[PDB]
Amino acid sequence: MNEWTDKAGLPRDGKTYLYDGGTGERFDQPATVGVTYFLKLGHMVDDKM
Amino acid sequence: VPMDTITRDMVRLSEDTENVYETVMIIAKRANQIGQQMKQDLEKKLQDFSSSNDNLEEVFENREQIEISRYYEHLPKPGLIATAEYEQDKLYHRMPGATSTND
Amino acid sequence: AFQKPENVLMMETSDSIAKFEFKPLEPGYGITIGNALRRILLSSLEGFAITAIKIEGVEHEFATIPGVLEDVTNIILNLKQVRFKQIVPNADVEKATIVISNSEVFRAGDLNAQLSNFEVLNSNLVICHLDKSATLTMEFSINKGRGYVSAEENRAEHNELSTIAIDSIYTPIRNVKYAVENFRVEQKTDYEKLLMEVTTDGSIRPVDALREAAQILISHFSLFAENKIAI
Amino acid sequence: AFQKPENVLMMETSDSIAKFEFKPLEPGYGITIGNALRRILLSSLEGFAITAIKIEGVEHEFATIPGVLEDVTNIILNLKQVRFKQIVPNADVEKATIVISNSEVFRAGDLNAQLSNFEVLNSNLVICHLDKSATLTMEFSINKGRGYVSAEENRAEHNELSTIAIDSIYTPIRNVKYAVENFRVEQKTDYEKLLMEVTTDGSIRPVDALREAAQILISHFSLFAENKIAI
Amino acid sequence: TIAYNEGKVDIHAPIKVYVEDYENGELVRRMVETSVGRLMVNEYVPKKVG
Amino acid sequence: LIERGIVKTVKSAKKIVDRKEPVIWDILEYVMKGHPVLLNRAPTLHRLGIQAFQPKLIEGKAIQLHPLSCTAFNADFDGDQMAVHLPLSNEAILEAQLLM
């Protein structure tokens, strides 16, 4: 995992810094960012009204 | 005194009024009378104002009748008035049928 | 005293990507400048896109045309993505008539920008794959706007039993940068580097958009500094 | 259309605190305008204050002087609260001397308005308790600056190791806060309300600080927008 | 609030300050050792506990 | 709308309140401001499962509720479908905003 993350040009640790739109502040602790797989379930609220 | 309606938080009514629940009811009565008097006043004077014509279109011809209507519509509901009367505590409650200090 | 900068430099690697640098600055002040610019740039600019479609031989968003490899849904969905450009001012709204009638693969630039008022930037996008024999007639409406609008609001324009309204993403910007770092002389401080990047669609060079954002922001502060009406 | 806020309001509770209203804002503009004005008003101001003093009859920093009820530390702290002002331009740096030798509560108004270019407003501010039995003589150094300066920093200004130097709160604005609110327009919600509160030192009406700050920021975008200006 | 608002002190550092608290239930004002922060919240604890 | 005078018939008022065309929600904003509403849980265990509140407009089709009150409902945010009620009588509304 670490070898691939290295060879992709990334922080070898999964962490990074981040910024806020509105204040430009650098969130003093490093936040985690990534890519994940995501599903939508069938309880759509249009039929709960 | 202006109210600018909010939600009320009370212990003062335990000072002037002996019981919470009786306090609620007497506020209810005062609110009732205040509402009745305002509703009759509004209905009489407005029907006098619009006695000339009652059609759908004709009511909006000057925008000022609507303006006064929404001004009074900008006034707090009766219960707020009665509550404010008890923080000012201008009223006194006693055995059945307590009434304002209007005399 | 007020350490005023004068160094505003442009470098412009391409017609669409540009850099800018601001030099020299008083501390803690460029972050303010740049973050204000980033917000306004990336929020509130103006662009164009397509809204309405009338296909011949199809009546609703779930049909299919004989001899065309995609649904009508995917035609509309990818037509959503085609970024445009003006060549003339004052072009309000436009209607187009495409008649593809040959054994082809129907692509973006294949759209004849046949109206003199307007053009297409991205020409090399694949709308659809026809067969050897499909005949297709399409009619477009392109219009200007801001931010984002969904479909059902665009139900305003008179479907006439055929017209299909589509989503429309109007924003003309794609990416923005600012960064800051100190620069110094020995023993004497308070030099600041602001380095900024603008990446657009090509519908307008970075300079015009940057100028417009600043014009709006100054237009806001103008009233809020001088006029002082009192309660 | 793009909807402008007009006629900023203020409530003006007193000469040291004030409130502000901005109506109506379009979304996201709340944080922008607010944060810009905040960092500007907290960014670029000016002032004068005490730097280093020497007290007669003092062995070193924390001896105890008889005849005065208040220790050295508390005297230092009280002088930190003395607020200055100028009547003559360019009188950047000043020195003075004070002698008191009678039974009195030493106050701020008792200070010898001897050096003509300089005044004190908060006259009734109390310093210390004094009787017949003690006498005090001391030296004042008053210097111009910006911000908040720790004890180490100002030792450059004539330290000499027997004149004890002190911090200095040069900043004329003491605290400013803000808030953002939602409110309505027909068909819609989420338009912004910006609420401001300012608390100064009394040397200047807060409306003046705000007006001047916003004028700075306008003059500062003008150049980074239009160094190479067209239209 | 001034020294924090100008980054000369972070949100958090042991500082000594002159504050008022009631000894049952009065009115002692001493030099406590505390931190901006605790000051910010204790701005909101009502002036009847200390 | 009646006290506006612009409308004389409840049929017209229903016609205008149903299709909800570009006319005033100002009345909803006003009335919503002094006419509290009773929020109602389904499996009420002890009274702290029924309350009143001052209602507020928001965007969309979901009920926004303050984070610190739910523990009274002893609920979770999985997606439950809380009920709401409107009193209609001023004695009731007073009991609401005085004890509820």
From TrEMBL, chain A:
Residues forming coiled coils: none
Family: Belongs to the RNA polymerase beta chain family.
Function description: DNA-dependent RNA polymerase catalyzes the transcription of DNA into RNA using the four ribonucleoside triphosphates as substrates.
Subunit description: The RNAP catalytic core consists of 2 alpha, 1 beta, 1 beta' and 1 omega subunit. When a sigma factor is associated with the core the holoenzyme is formed, which can initiate transcription.
Full protein name: DNA-directed RNA polymerase subunit beta
Gene that specifies this protein: rpoB
Included range, full protein: 1124 to 1172 of 1269
Automatic annotation (TrEMBL), chain B:
Organism this protein belongs to: Porphyromonas gingivalis (Bacteroides gingivalis)
UniProt xrefs under Pfam families: RNA_pol_Rpb6
SMART domains linked: RNA_pol_Rpb6
A GO term for molecular function: DNA binding
Protein name: DNA-directed RNA polymerase subunit omega
Biological process annotations from GO: DNA-templated transcription
Recorded GO CC terms: DNA-directed RNA polymerase complex
Keywords: DNA-directed RNA polymerase, Transcription
